Amino acid sequence: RPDFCLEPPYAGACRAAAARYFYNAKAGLCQTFAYGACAAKRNNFKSAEDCLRTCGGA
């Protein structure tokens, strides 16, 4: 799996709900973001299929 795919989102304080997705190294699946979670630099795919494609696979 791509290094950056291992990069998790930081939970601080920021409003966001874009149609982006990221990989969850701790769950093997992606997420369309939630809560005040900020968008990750590398860990951000335009689509979950995109995340799973690059980050996922197995």
General description of the model:
The chain is low in regular secondary structure and 58 residues long. The protein has a single domain (1-58), classed as Pancreatic trypsin inhibitor Kunitz domain (Factor Xa Inhibitor). Helices cover 12% and strands 10% of the residues. It is built from 1 helix and 2 strands; from the N terminus they run ββα. The protein has one helix at 48-54; strands spanning 22-24, 29-31. A hairpin with a 4-residue loop joins strand 1 and strand 2 (29-31).
Straight-line distance between termini: 10 Å
Summed up, the domain count is: 1
Order of helices and strands: EEH
Q: Which strand-content bin applies to the residues? A: 5-15%
Q: Return the CATH architecture.
A: Irregular
Do you know the CATH topology?
Factor Xa Inhibitor
| Global Rg | 10 Å
CATH fourth-tier homologous superfamily: Pancreatic trypsin inhibitor Kunitz domain
How many individual β-strands? 2
What is the percent of helical residues?
10-25%
Strand arrangement, major sheet:
1-2
Shape: globular
Structure annotation, total helices: 1
Which structural class should the secondary elements be placed in? little secondary structure
CATH C-level class is Few Secondary Structures
Strand count, sense and barrel status of the largest sheet are: 2 strands, antiparallel
